[PDB]
Design a protein around this ligand. Structure first.
Ligand SMILES: CCCCCCCCCCCCCCCCCC(=O)OC[C@H](COP(=O)([O-])OCC(O)COP(=O)([O-])OC[C@@H](COC(=O)CCCCCCCCCCCCCCCCC)OC(=O)CCCCCCCCCCCCCCCCC)OC(=O)CCCCCCCCCCCCCCCCC
Ligand SMILES: CCCCCCCCCCC(CCCCCCCCCC)(CO[C@H]1O[C@@H](CO)[C@H](O[C@@H]2O[C@@H](CO)[C@H](O)[C@@H](O)[C@@H]2O)[C@@H](O)[C@@H]1O)CO[C@H]1O[C@@H](CO)[C@H](O[C@@H]2O[C@@H](CO)[C@H](O)[C@@H](O)[C@@H]2O)[C@@H](O)[C@H]1O
Ligand SMILES: CCCCCCCCCCC(CCCCCCCCCC)(CO[C@H]1O[C@@H](CO)[C@H](O[C@@H]2O[C@@H](CO)[C@H](O)[C@@H](O)[C@@H]2O)[C@@H](O)[C@@H]1O)CO[C@H]1O[C@@H](CO)[C@H](O[C@@H]2O[C@@H](CO)[C@H](O)[C@@H](O)[C@@H]2O)[C@@H](O)[C@H]1O
Ligand SMILES: CCCCCCCCCCCCCCCCCC(=O)OC[C@H](COP(=O)([O-])OCC[N+](C)(C)C)OC(=O)CCCCCCCCCCCCCCCCC
Ligand SMILES: CCCCCCCCCCCCCCCCCC(=O)OC[C@H](COP(=O)([O-])OCC[N+](C)(C)C)OC(=O)CCCCCCCCCCCCCCCCC
Ligand SMILES: CCCCCCCCCCCCCCCCCC(=O)OC[C@H](COP(=O)([O-])OCC[N+](C)(C)C)OC(=O)CCCCCCCCCCCCCCCCC
Ligand SMILES: CCCCCCCCCCCCCCCCCC(=O)OC[C@H](COP(=O)(O)OCCN)OC(=O)CCCCCCCCCCCCCCCCC
Ligand SMILES: CCCCCCCCCCCCCCCCCC(=O)OC[C@H](COP(=O)(O)OCCN)OC(=O)CCCCCCCCCCCCCCCCC
Ligand SMILES: CCCCCCCCCCCCCCCCCC(=O)OC[C@H](COP(=O)(O)OCCN)OC(=O)CCCCCCCCCCCCCCCCC
Lengths: 75, 558, 494, 101, 61, 81
């Protein structure tokens, strides 16, 4: 079936059919309120949140050789 | 020399009606063009922006003479298709230099070599081809509005005649009719533009028009709107003839309808002449000072056509299934690059323009030669495909479908690799000559602030790459539908070959099979040289790129 | 003749011999594969010789050849510490990749060997060229052979995979090319020893960064630009997959050390938070989807995405340990992903003909040698100490933390999630019951071939996990040159 | 002092670690400066490494008493840790600074 | 056993003096100034080449 | 390594090889072996000729560079007023 002869496998049709659905699922995506909301949350909101937090704390702290009588804050 | 060859060939052709003379007449046209190269090679030992000739109606420049030679060389290469039979018989006992020069081989060749094929029996074909060449050389060298019109009609009329010279084909006669009808419309725009120049300026001289434009470029009674407006109408007729969008619709039908060997000449020769002629006209009308004239510059038609040719050429090619229509849309896309380099008038863009045109002409030449050679290689193959059986004018265009190339890598791998190298050069994959061509045009466009057009060029290139990849997928990723003919090699079907010496005395006899029939050497060698030029350009680029550098420095020499 | 040109020339000779030996002897395909393998061994021997002669603290490019015959596009070859280890990774991986496909390539064997040999020359030329436009030429040259390799030897979905990797890489690369051409116009060349002395103005740097970053994020790949990898790395033949994940992913990383760090320092520092948000998002999203991936080769392919996020964050850390850790992780990923692709795409796939996880269970009972190497490889993927993967992850993660703490803390969560998908995948295949009832025949354990490609790969990760000085010592001096910044009492000495 | 080894001298910088009065078109002179800035940073860094080594020996020597007997090394290491770092040459190559500013 | 043997014979000896093989490896990979000399010559040449192209590309129309 | 003569001698050899491969004819049969010295010889001729083009092209480009500098100089001296 794929080049070299492999061992006999009891290829279960249900499991094979599930594997085919996963390979072809992209062909059936549609924009709905649910899919748009999920896609917007994962792609825009969460990344922009980490981006905003990384932006606002960039350069805020330094630990190197900080003693008592000093601050971790740099800014 | 080109005029003497045409008249001498015409006279010999006039008193012959023998169709077996066609192959000989084609070979003489090759010899004639080699002399034309020799004379123009001798005419390159001066430096000038231009010398007017013959009462100022023509002119010569170093650039003019270089592209005269280039047109001759491309025409010699195309002329091989009608000067040699497509297939040969080769055996390892007739391979020595003494055998080739003193011995002879005798066998029944008529069916094997296709001696009486259609492209071998048109007596006037090399002659009409020379008429088109004369139209093209004259247009490069034209210094004058009347000379422009005469030259462009001469080249155009021969192209219409070439598209119809296969008079027994309904497809060919249809394409010739379409070319002539819409080409007649485009010629009217050229004549209209030339006429509006004359009625306003009172001169037919290109020198005089450039002088009037030069004085009018200062920073009220006869403000010179006419020059840009005339050249705009003038340029649209030339945009049709290079098949730039949106004046492109004719060429995918015409190139597909006419026979493939004709398409090779028809699709390549005309763009070289019109683009070279446009180059000088673009340089000498460029308004240096930002005045009102620059606002209405006729060269924006070139830039809009460039934009539209980038998009149409790549998008429409996505759903093409006929191989010759795909090449037509591939050319329109590549014309978009050429038009971008011409529109930006800079030393870098002119260098990019000159290099791009020559590399594109040799590459599109390699694609047509490989397509023809593949078509002539199926002689000893059979297919039971139902789609292939319903194709029209199979003899004129043996390969018409991309699907016909399915599994061709299993039929002939090195010829399939040559096709793949040529197509990857069209995409612009380094280090092929096509990448370096695209790279130079992008550089200049970015350096002169054409960023928006630079970005549309890269985006269209990815879209264009899709249908290029689709041809390659067909050749490599599948098994073929063609099988070797059982009877061509059936273990009992041997044809006889006699080997004889200079005294016509038999030396030996040998029995031969379909496995002893090969592509003729002129086509294999031409594909091989061009494929290796595309592939190995990175080691050979100095002199070729330096030639364009010197030519542009002369054209810009303040 | 330079030793670096010998490196590029040996595989071309082997291509010539493979394509002509039919005229001196139906030649057995074993002879073809012997020629290609010995060709890769000699290339490895040459790279070892170069490394023995290489000097660890020189800021001059070594083993260069004078040209004095300048043209428009001349190939200049040179090596320093930040490229020497990528050359070694390419020359060690290539023989292993050839042996991993010794039996599974059954048709078109000559074409397969010539593509792999040509891939060796092109990938090596990427690490050795001393010009930025030469880097693009070699980076893009590998696409047509890769397109053909996938399409001639790939699995059922090979056409869609071949198109994806070609069009994604081309599209990203076209934005890098525009960035390179702008540099070439401002400076007059892209030769390293000239461009690295140029100082681009800040706004130019910003628009240069975008365009180089777009390409490197397509090639990393970052999450959301990674479907080409999930297709191509799975549909590829096994030797293609090893080359694609061990060497081809490393191009964007070595590219950062030549194209961003020395010439775009101000844009790199000002945009690190955008790089870090993308790298942080990639670490979490790729990890969660790896946990739910049911194709065994796709699961190993998706874990490459999560590891490459950490070396990408380490390369933008602007700290010595983060930069060295990035190179260390890149190298350690090459040995581990090669071994896990061999385990899945070469051992499981050859035996069963399927890549679905649902059909595997309890393989330890009948395949103890496979389960031993598979487990050690899964610890490497989880970044377990004593592998070079821990050393690279720790140093990369420390530099990312010190540069931007919130980004490092999120990136650190990889220590939890890489373990999760590695241990989950190991347990479901090797453990998790008795031998799967879907197997009708019993399975043989590793053949000598499979044992000795896994043992060799496992050897490299463990030996370098215990003595990583073997790479770091040759990295320290050269990697100093890409750091940007100053100390107040250390700078401007008089 | 420990004699400067034959190997050490082969790599000793012949130029001061600075970019002032360095012609950037002189490839040899620029790379010499870059090497001098890099090497000087590493020396300061390797100095801290040696101080840390001495601090380690006294800690395991003085035990309970380390908080009182290891202060001199303690202070030295903190000073080096606060000041020494491999920062590269490339900011100082691109940015000239003056004391009189 | 081989690792123990090879490590012992490769030691610099009781005094810090390189062995016979140590002097060979140091000699073959000497390059006292070869890289710097060649690198400097190439950098200046491509510097000048960029100069020439800048002159030709920016020439006044 | 870009020695023109050796490169174009090699180019001619590669043309014959590719041509034989395209024709699906054997790469080396003894009575055909004269073709490789021939194709390589024609390649060597093309490259001795390219050598002399390069010499002329270099001189032309060197004269052009001087003219541009001379043009630049006089214009600069004209602006001195
Ligand atoms: C980049 C640019 C630079 C690249 C340079 C690299 C090197 C390229 C080398 C090309 C060499 C071509 C060649 O000689 O082919 C050998 C070719 C060997 O092919 P074959 O398949 O072994 O044998 C022929 C087949 O049996 C049956 O053969 P066939 O009947 O199928 O074809 C007959 C013959 C063509 O018919 C001929 O008789 C050729 C006529 C050429 C005339 C040249 C001299 C003119 C002046 C005469 C005085 O074939 C060719 O030679 C093909 C020519 C294609 C040239 C294309 C060049 C552009 C692309 O032809 C011969 O039989 C050799 C004898 C004649 C040689 C030609 C004269 C000497 C060479 C002069 C070169 C110019 C100076
Ligand atoms: C894959 C190979 C790489 C490509 C090689 C081409 C680039 C190198 C050749 C470029 C080329 C012609 C180009 C024609 C081809 C057109 C397009 C080519 C297709 C490109 C794929 C440009 O030569 C011209 O270039 C112009 C600017 O570029 C100059 O302006 C001209 O003055 C110059 O002649 C060289 O032409 C040369 O021919 C030879 C005659 O043997 C001339 O030598 C001498 O001429 C007389 C004293 O001089 C003597 O009487 C004659 O005895 C002597 O011999 C040269 O003088 C020159 O004329
Ligand atoms: C997306 C990757 C871009 C690929 C890399 C670009 C390579 C550099 C081009 C960036 C560009 C336009 C950017 C326009 C928006 C980009 C596309 C928008 C989104 C596309 C979907 C910056 O152009 C800006 O350059 C600034 C100065 O640096 C100026 O300030 C601005 O006024 C100017 O607009 C063009 O300028 C470039 O040309 C050179 C001339 O010698 C300039 O010196 C530089 O300026 C250089 O940069
Ligand atoms: C592609 C490169 C094309 C170069 C064309 C060429 O060689 O012309 C120069 C040459 C110039 O020839 P030539 O006249 O200079 O020959 C040498 C003259 N002496 C001896 C005085 C030095 O043209 C030709 O000879 C070729 C003419 C036939 C062209 C056939 C090509 C098909
Ligand atoms: C391409 C198709 C084949 C070539 C067609 C002929 C070339 C046409 C242009 C041309 O003549 O230039 C080549 C050149 C033109 O001259 P040339 O100046 O370029 O080459 C050197 C000329 N001599 C030898 C005097 C130094 O033609 C020749 O040189 C051929 C000389 C030999 C003549 C034919 C063999 C003798 C047969 C005796 C009977
Ligand atoms: C900055 C970058 C950000 C990018 C953000 C968007 C990400 C999109 C990435 C685009 C680059 C990869 C495109 C891959 C498309 C390949 C494909 O669709 O399958 C090919 C398919 C394979 O699909 P298949 O194998 O599943 O089934 C088709 C079967 N055959 C091939 C026989 C027809 O092969 C084809 O040739 C058919 C394609 C027809 C035309 C489709 C062209 C789409 C290309 C879009 C490029 C446009 C770029 C503009 C931006
Ligand atoms: C070149 C340096 C030496 C490399 C060859 C050293 C190994 C050797 O001695 O060759 C043995 C190898 C196997 O022996 P062999 O009898 O051919 O087995 C096949 C029988 N059907 O025989 C071979 O087939 C080796 C063929 C030579 C391969 C050399 C590859 C060189 C490529 C870069 C130059
Ligand atoms: C640079 C060096 C040259 C580039 C590589 C060209 C190699 C051509 C020499 C091989 C000649 C040959 O005979 O190959 C034959 C082989 C299939 O033929 P065969 O084995 O006879 O089929 C038997 C069927 N039972 O066919 C093959 O092996 C060819 C395999 C495909 C070639 C590589 C895949 C294409 C790569 C992109 C090509 C276009 C871009 C060029 C890339 C070069 C590097 C940038
Ligand atoms: C889960 C595994 C985890 C592994 C962790 C890694 C190990 C670290 C923790 C253990 C550390 C102990 C390492 C041994 C320390 C001493 C090494 C040694 O053998 O030294 C002797 C030899 C000569 O000594 P020398 O350095 O010259 O002293 C004079 C200097 N003037 O020096 C040498 O060069 C000899 C080197 C020979 C190899 C050393 C011995 C290795 C012993 C461990 C082997 C374990 C594997 C066993 C394999 C199967 C054995 C049946």
């Amino acid at each position: 079936m794929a080049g070299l002869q492999h061992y006999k496998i009891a290829m279960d049709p249900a499991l094979v059919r599930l594997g085919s659905m996963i390979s072809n699922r992209y062909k059936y995506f549609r924009w709905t309120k649910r899919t748009a909301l999920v896609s917007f949350m994962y792609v825009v909101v969460v990344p922009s949140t980490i981006g905003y937090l990384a932006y606002k704390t960039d350069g805020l702290w330094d630990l190197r050789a900080k003693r008592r009588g000093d601050l971790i804050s740099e800014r | 020399m080109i005029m003497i060859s045409i008249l001498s060939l015409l006279l010999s052709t006039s008193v012959t009606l023998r169709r077996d003379m066609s192959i000989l007449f084609n070979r003489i046209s090759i010899i004639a063009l080699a002399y034309c190269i020799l004379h123009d090679t001798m005419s390159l030992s001066f430096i000038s922006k231009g010398i007017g000739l013959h009462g100022g109606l023509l002119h010569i420049t170093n650039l003019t003479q270089i592209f005269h030679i280039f047109i001759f060389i491309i025409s010699i290469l195309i002329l091989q298709l009608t000067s040699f039979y497509p297939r040969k018989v080769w055996i390892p006992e007739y391979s020595s230099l003494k055998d080739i020069f003193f011995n002879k081989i005798l066998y029944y060749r008529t069916k094997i070599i296709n001696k009486m094929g259609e492209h071998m029996k048109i007596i006037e074909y090399p002659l009409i081809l020379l008429f088109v060449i004369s139209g093209a050389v004259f247009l490069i060298s034209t210094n004058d509005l009347v000379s422009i019109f005469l030259s462009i009609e001469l080249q155009s009329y021969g192209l219409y005649l070439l598209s119809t010279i296969y008079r027994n084909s309904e497809l060919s006669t249809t394409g010739g009719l379409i070319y002539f009808l819409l080409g007649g419309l485009s010629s009217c725009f050229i004549l209209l533009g030339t006429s509006l120049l004359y009625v306003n300026s009172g001169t037919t001289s290109l020198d005089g028009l450039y002088i009037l434009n030069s004085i009018s470029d200062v920073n009220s009674w006869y403000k010179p709107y006419y020059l840009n407006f005339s050249l705009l109408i003038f340029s649209i007729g030339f945009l049709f003839k290079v098949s730039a969008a949106p004046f492109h619709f004719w060429s995918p039908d015409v190139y597909d309808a006419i026979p493939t060997i004709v398409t090779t000449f028809v699709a390549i020769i005309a763009k070289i002449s019109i683009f070279i002629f446009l180059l000088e006209l673009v340089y000498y009308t460029n308004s240096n000072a930002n005045s009102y004239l620059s606002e209405f510059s006729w060269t924006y038609a070139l830039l809009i056509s460039s934009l539209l040719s980038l998009i149409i050429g790549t998008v429409v090619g996505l759903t093409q299934f006929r191989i010759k229509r795909l090449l037509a849309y591939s050319t329109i896309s590549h014309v978009g690059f050429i038009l971008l380099a011409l529109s930006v008038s800079s030393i870098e863009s002119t260098q990019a323009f000159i290099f791009y045109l020559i590399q594109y002409s040799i590459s599109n030449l390699n694609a047509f030669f490989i397509l023809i050679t593949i078509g002539f290689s199926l002689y000893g193959y059979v297919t039971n495909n139902k789609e292939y059986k319903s194709l029209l004018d199979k003899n004129n265009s043996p390969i018409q479908l991309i699907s016909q190339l399915k599994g061709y890598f299993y039929i002939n791998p090195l010829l399939s690799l040559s096709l793949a190298i040529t197509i990857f050069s069209f995409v612009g994959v380094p280090p092929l000559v096509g990448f370096f061509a695209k790279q130079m045009v992008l550089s200049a466009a970015l350096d002169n602030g054409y960023i928006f057009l630079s970005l549309i060029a890269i985006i269209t290139s990815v879209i264009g790459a899709v249908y290029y990849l689709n041809v390659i997928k067909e050749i490599f990723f599948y098994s073929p539908e063609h099988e070797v003919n059982p009877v061509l090699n059936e273990s009992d079907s041997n044809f006889s070959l006699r080997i004889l010496n200079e005294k016509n005395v038999l030396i030996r006899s040998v029995l031969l099979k379909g496995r002893n029939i090969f592509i003729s050497s002129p086509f294999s060698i031409t594909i091989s040289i061009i494929t290796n030029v595309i592939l190995l350009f990175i080691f050979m680029n100095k002199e070729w790129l330096s030639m364009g550098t010197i030519l542009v420095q002369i054209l810009f020499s303040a | 003749m330079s030793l670096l040109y010998v490196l590029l020339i040996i595989p071309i000779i082997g291509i010539f011999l493979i394509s002509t030996i039919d005229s001196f002897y139906f030649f057995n395909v074993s002879y073809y594969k012997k020629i290609a393998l010995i060709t890769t061994i000699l290339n490895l021997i040459v790279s070892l010789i170069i490394y023995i002669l290489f000097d660890f603290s020189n800021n001059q490019f070594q083993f260069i050849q004078e040209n004095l015959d300048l043209s428009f596009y001349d190939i200049y070859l040179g090596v320093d510490g930040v490229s020497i280890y990528f050359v070694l990774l390419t020359t060690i991986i290539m023989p292993i990749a050839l042996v991993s496909n010794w039996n599974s390539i059954t048709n078109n064997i000559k074409s397969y060997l010539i593509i792999m040999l040509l891939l060796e020359t092109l990938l090596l030329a990427v690490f050795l060229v001393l010009d930025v436009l030469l880097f693009y030429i070699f980076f893009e040259s590998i696409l047509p052979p890769l397109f053909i390799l996938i399409g001639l030897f790939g699995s059922s979905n090979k056409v869609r995979a071949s198109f994806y990797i070609f069009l994604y890489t081309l599209l990203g690369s076209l934005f890098l090319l525009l960035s390179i051409l702008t540099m070439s116009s401002i400076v007059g060349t892209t030769y390293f020893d000239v461009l690295l002395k140029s100082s681009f103005e800040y706004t130019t740097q910003l628009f240069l960064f975008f365009g180089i970053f777009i390409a490197f994020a397509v090639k990393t790949p970052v999450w959301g630009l990674n479907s080409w990898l999930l297709r191509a790395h799975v549909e590829s033949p096994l030797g293609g997959s090893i080359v694609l994940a061990a060497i081809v992913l490393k191009l964007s990383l070595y590219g950062v050390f030549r194209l961003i760090l020395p010439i775009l320092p101000q844009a790199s520092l000002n945009l690190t938070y955008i790089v870090y948000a993308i790298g942080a998002i990639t670490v979490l999203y790729a990890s969660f989807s790896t946990l739910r991936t049911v194709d065994v080769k796709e699961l190993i392919a998706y874990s490459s995405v999560a590891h490459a996020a950490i070396y990408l964050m380490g390369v933008f850390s602007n700290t010595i340990q983060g930069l060295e850790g990035a190179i260390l992780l890149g190298l350690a990923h090459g040995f581990v992903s090669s071994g896990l692709f061999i385990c899945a795409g070469g051992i499981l796939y050859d035996r069963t003909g399927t890549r679905l996880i649902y059909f595997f269970r309890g393989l330890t009972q009948i395949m103890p040698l496979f389960s031993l190497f598979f487990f050690i490889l899964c610890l490497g993927n989880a970044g377990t100490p004593l592998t070079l993967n821990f050393v690279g992850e720790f140093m990369s993660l420390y530099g990312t933390l010190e540069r931007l703490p919130i980004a490092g803390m999120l990136a650190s969560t990889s220590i939890i999630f890489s373990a999760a998908y590695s241990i989950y995948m190991y347990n479901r295949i090797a453990f998790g019951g008795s031998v799967s009832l879907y197997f009708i025949d019993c399975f043989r354990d590793l053949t000598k071939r499979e044992f000795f490609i896994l043992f060799t790969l496992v050897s490299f990760t463990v030996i370098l996990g215990i003595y990583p000085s073997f790479v770091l010592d040759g990295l320290h001096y050269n990697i100093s040159s890409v750091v940007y910044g100053i100390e107040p009492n250390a700078s401007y000495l008089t | 002092p420990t004699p400067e080894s034959e190997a050490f001298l082969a790599k000793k910088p012949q130029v001061p670690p600075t970019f002032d009065g360095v012609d950037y078109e002189d490839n040899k002179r620029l790379k010499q400066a870059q090497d001098a800035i890099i090497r000087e940073q590493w020396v300061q860094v390797m100095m801290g490494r040696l101080v840390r080594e001495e601090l380690s020996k006294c800690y395991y020597r003085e035990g309970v008493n380390h908080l009182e007997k290891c202060g001199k090394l303690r202070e030295r290491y903190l000073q080096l840790l606060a000041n020494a770092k491999v920062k590269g040459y490339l900011f100082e190559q691109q940015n000239y600074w003056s004391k009189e500013n | 056993a081989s690792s123990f043997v090879i490590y012992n014979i490769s030691r610099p000896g009781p005094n810090g003096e390189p062995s016979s093989l140590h002097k060979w490896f140091s000699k073959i990979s000497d390059y006292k100034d070869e890289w710097e000399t060649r690198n400097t010559l190439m950098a200046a040449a491509l510097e000048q080449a960029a100069h020439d192209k800048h002159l030709l590309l920016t020439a006044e129309r | 390594m870009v020695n023109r003569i050796l490169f174009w001698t090699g180019f001619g050899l590669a043309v014959r090889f590719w041509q034989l491969g395209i024709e699906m004819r054997p790469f080396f049969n003894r009575k055909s072996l004269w073709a490789y010295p021939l194709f390589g010889g024609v390649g060597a001729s093309f490259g001795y000729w390219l050598q002399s083009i390069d010499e002329k092209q270099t001189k032309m480009l060197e004269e052009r560079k001087q003219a541009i500098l001379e043009k630049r100089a006089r214009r600069a001296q004209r602006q001195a007023e």
